[model samples]
Target chain A: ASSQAWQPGVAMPNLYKMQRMLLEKCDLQNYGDSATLPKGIMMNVAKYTQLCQYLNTLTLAVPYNMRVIHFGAGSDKGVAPGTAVLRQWLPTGTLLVDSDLNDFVSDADSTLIGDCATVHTANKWDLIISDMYDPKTKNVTKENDSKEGFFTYICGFIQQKLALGGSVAIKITEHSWNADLYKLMGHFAWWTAFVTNVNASSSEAFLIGCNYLGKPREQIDGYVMHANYIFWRNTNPIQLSSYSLFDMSKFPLKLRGTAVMSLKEGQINDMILSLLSKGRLIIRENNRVVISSDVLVNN
Target chain B: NSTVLSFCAFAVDAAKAYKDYLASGGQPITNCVKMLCTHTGTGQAITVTPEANMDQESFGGASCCLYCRCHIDHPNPKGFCDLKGKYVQIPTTCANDPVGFTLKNTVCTVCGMWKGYGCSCDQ
Candidate 1:
């Protein structure tokens, strides 16, 4: 206990170090607040930044001169920063696709920027990025509505336009109800038939599938309710199965047994009711139970 | 050389034989005398003979003894000397109910006369 080690004084710049750590860990420049974003959106910027960095690493592995596509290319900050990072990291050209042209930029270089509606006719990009927004009215639940129409449109478009050896990045927002987007991320990862290498630090998640170019788009709109799906057209589609961590506790009966006993019927029914009570289960038209799986388990 | 066993000894032997017969596929003939002696009841002997036909209705209507005659209708009489008598009959019942017979109560006068006299009724 001889002479106390030099302790930094209260006047010493602790706030500066904290701020520096925050800035380094989470690139906050990309997430700008908009009226559409809910109030608590700022709290999740760090999460998005981590996801962007992870995506950057994955996209870097693609070959040079590959075309990258973005769906729902909103105000470019969320889409552009990732694109720029991917372009810098990977020797590939990037294309940003938005539903509305005005949403991204008033006027831009035709070769570089265009809406999703027009981008397909111009060129067949290798990687398609989808971050399309559900009109605020349509975002009834956080993860569901936003992904429904967006995924349907993307899957339809990818069937024809996506080039061979291309990939896509989709930006998904975590709804107020669902704070952890990993489960939904897992479903979207499976549905799009992409391997989820890294989950975004932000509310969104990233999925990468191989050999997406020029192949028929498997119908994945059914899985949109789970998470925001990103489709990548790689020369070789990665062989990754569905995420295993999600709770399938409510599956009707045991898949394999001598005789399918109704042993767990009451327990599973109770679980379903509990989820509904907690507002985790989204009841659709005609009282059909929706979002009973892991997509809404944590939500 | 040996005197024939008495009815009691014969009943005991029959009981043993019936037990063995039951162990085989044949149904046991209940020894009423043994059952009455072993059990406390009126001590009345009640014999239970296994049915020939084994049909519920046949057993319900008929009674049987240790040996009962069964009759078969003979369609044609050939060289057999008994054919001219009447019906060509055989004791078709099992050993458990050797005397049990399945016959409709309505008897033909001609067949009854031949069975009683052991003579050809038509002759």
Candidate 2:
């Protein structure tokens, strides 16, 4: 194992053993009743390790003395790794929670499912995380396209939750981020300015935007070092820019199959739709169609 | 690649759990779950070899089998890049004492313009 580059104290949380402990030792069973949590159930080992390593690193970066809340935190998608790790590092009195809209999908601490716009805490918080999209469709403004949509909720929650000098780590699509939202962030505090591929049109950026403690050019990395495999990462904080959408003409699209060739003005729409969702057909270029799912639809 | 290892690991474990259930008399399911990029900018399924990450012999059985549908190795990387048009690759390995893994991650640097996935203009 190499030196830690990004995460402060802990490495990625254990899954195979942890899951084994949950099942064998603690007898923790009954997983995935609603949401898809590969990490909690020990279903997919490598991927969740990578995800937990990233998430735990992020959680470690926050100030330990203050309250921490993850608003859109799902049941156990990746939160379990971070929560388990934080419990070890922080004092028992340290406040930490994971909340989501769906109670059944939540392993959160509280009983009420709180929305960011108005979830008031008696004590101010040092950090708040937003894993947002259309709570209804679980998408961005592209799907909701309203002033009060996902992006709005993002800023709305930030202003609502982040305490004085506190920070925020946000997850949103680069395609959805824009000048308006960029400016919205600046009004509250400092933020990053360089935006590239958080991954792709459907790519996600785990951006750490901050209070007085952060620099505009934020930099952080939290992965263990080893090469030629998937678990080791540079774990650097994503630097981003550009608030406006890109020219669709600049995209490199190659779809090959048995049907027609070329997307017409009538059909070919957002290319990202096919990349993220694992089970939907989002693009049709030539005979090849780009689907958002890993498994091909049932034959 | 990490994605290749990821899907392969998932398929292997899931198949084990599924078989254990049937041996205890549970409904048998024989459907393939696809995910990942092992080949160039496209999705592909994982090949179930005689060996798994831990060389567990519980895989590749007919009673139940876990199917991986992502590609991540070399020459043709699909399980790496995202819908947002970012290029990535995963290198993962496991620890035996208590079963854990690491994903050595890499990506195509943005020294230039690269566009494969974006949105269709509506507004």
Candidate 3:
């Protein structure tokens, strides 16, 4: 049992922050084997944390019993800690494995050793998560994780597993952000990109989707993935015209004062605001201190 | 047509972008304003070389640069990111003319790829 639970009043926009927040609030209980997870690999854990964060933020529950099926689980030495961290946060009966639950294991020495889409049924998970990719082309398939690894996997998964109020949090990447592919995602919901870190590894982005029409998350902040919170939350379900990464919707930098402000889910905005108060930075949305966030300073 | 303005007209803009780059600070930043006309291989490209140089590209133009402007119009004259992951449709009309142009897949100022510091766009 959890020593404590997430407090509703203390909402966090992403999981990376929520996990640390929970570790303290949840009664300091040793939730899983994740405590031993190497700190260096903590970045990957942030991915799962954000997924759960999206789930919790959507459902607004400490244990919302979000029916989750994480494809390519128990892999990625770097990602295991995140799986374990997720283990701590999720309640039982909400987690499903590829094909069946009986096959759930760490190293994933499985009852089923294959793609989840191969055994697709009308299971309707509230969230479908994955760091899984084609070991061959490093592509993420939408339907049959193997039969076709790119478009079919992403689009097909929606038809099979997505519950009406549910979401799919796939590891976000540059490929998914492609105009055509991103529009496909927008067709389903207000998809967002939650970039937890910057310039760290190639695995720097998370493409998230929900069945709803509005976006709850925000775009990532910077170019590098090592220590930044660069993410995007889709505001319109089919905003085909909103795919450009460089826009006001991606950041809150409307020229409040020298430094541009990034609008994310956490203390980053607070960080910028704190500095803005001290006269250390001035943010001009496209360099115009004279206007609003939506207007670009065409100097 | 509005596809290819006079070569002199294109060259002047190309030279000005470089001048502005140096005038602003000469920080070695590749400050460029580009216009590409796409139909065949010889779609005109006005680009600046990295050494603060400039070029208005021309190839085997069985086709040609029409200086092709379009009919659509922009509410604002400046650029911004849509945050939508969609390409932009741009209208370029010097004055009252027959058409406008849809600027597709071109990076705007707010984009990190303009500096080549982000993921996937290193290309």
Candidate 4:
């Protein structure tokens, strides 16, 4: 019943270019309630489009009937046009949800109504996705969303509940790129931060961490928990060390490039320019250029 | 008979770290130590303040352990103390009994380690 499916891929060397292509391919009218979703709840076209772009960047197909959880299910219960986009991409995969908001609806195979932060279960998900955001602080000035909302507690959930080698697709604002965030992400096998729209002035950004390294649960929790502490104290979070985000010794040379180029451009073009200046990325012409992901550049 | 170096010898490095720690509002020495030490329960390294504008620290004038010495001797000196095995920080009392002083030609009588600098032994 869904449209053409899309799956996750490696963080391609040319991520920005691929995002532009997907943006061009995506159309808002197609996702409108009249075309797909049932009539009701407000549909966010921008998020729908952004999710479309975000999901396509992933190159791997969902393993046979993989366990997946989508936080911030809204009133749609994982059937929002954005969530629907994922359903299409992952046809065999059935989505699950547990939201803080109370609106009884059952689009996903399983749904639980509770605060996602405190929800208890023995289940460990293979893929965890969260688009959770604050209700009142929806404007552009919102700097930190992870501190207050379910995202804060969900981090503890992620550290403890995510299956080893699982992947995470979470949304974070542009300014939310702190040391804690990067350190939390550094435990993953590979990760990249990108924005759906390059031209839009919106500070919205998305980060995907693939292949969790199975870091010690307490240690991962310590990083996020300490971040929570710093968040409340309004103190600056600790910073990342000079060491590479992912250990290269574990990966072969062919994939080492992807591991080294963990940081990527989101809505802004700063990273590309920075890479170009360092001679790691050489642009031959408008359509062609040589880019190396192996080069490690300190940010 | 015991041998000892001048007082200026041992206190120099510790003094530098101590002064930085003092000026920085006497910030708790936990941050850097945590950063340098890895938890035995979990393999995670403790996070450190980036370019720590504050919270400078030293080992409280403790002598280097065999693990710390090996890192210094066999390989090039590490930028920071990386304690080996399950030990998070150097022990206040050396388990090996005879411990080298932070300064040259000196050792603690109670635990065979020097306190302050040169030949002083508070313990």
| DockQ (CA atoms), all models | 0.00, 0.01, 0.01, 0.01
Best by TM-score: 4
Residue A244 local lDDT, model 2? 12
- Local error of candidate 3 at residue A52 (angstroms): 3.2
Summarize candidate 2's per-residue lDDT along A1-299 as a digit string, tens digits. Answer: 22331221122222311121110111112211222222212222212222333433221223323455665644433223223222222333445666555442222233235444444443445556555554344443342122345566666555544443455655543233333344444432334321122121123344445442212322221111011001111223222211111111111112111121223335433342222111112122212111111222585
- Distance (Å) between predicted and true CA of A74, model 2? 1.6
Which regions of candidate 1 fall more than 4 Å away from where they truly are? A1-49, A56-61, A76-80, A92-100, A103-115, A137-148, A173-203, A213-299, B1-123
lDDT of 4 at B31: 11
**Which of candidates 1 and 4 is the stronger one according to TM-score?**
4
Docking quality band of candidate 4, CAPRI definitions: incorrect
Model 3 chain B: lowest-lDDT 10 consecutive positions: B60-69
Q: Where is the poorest 10-residue window by lDDT in model 1 chain B?
A: B31-40
> Could you tell me the TM-score of chain A in candidate 2?
0.42
> Candidate 3 DockQ category?
incorrect
lDDT of 1 at A197: 18
Task: Tell me the lDDT of candidate 3.
Answer: 0.32
- Give the top-scoring candidate (DockQ): 2
Q: Is candidate 2 or candidate 4 better by TM-score?
A: 4
* Deviating ranges (above 4 Å) for candidate 4: A1-56, A59-61, A75-79, A93-95, A98-100, A104-106, A138-148, A174-179, A216-299, B1-123
* List of clashing residue pairs for candidate 4: A7-A58, A8-A58, A8-A59, A8-A60, A9-A58, A9-A59, B108-B112, B108-B113
For each candidate, what is chain B's TM-score? 0.21, 0.19, 0.17, 0.22
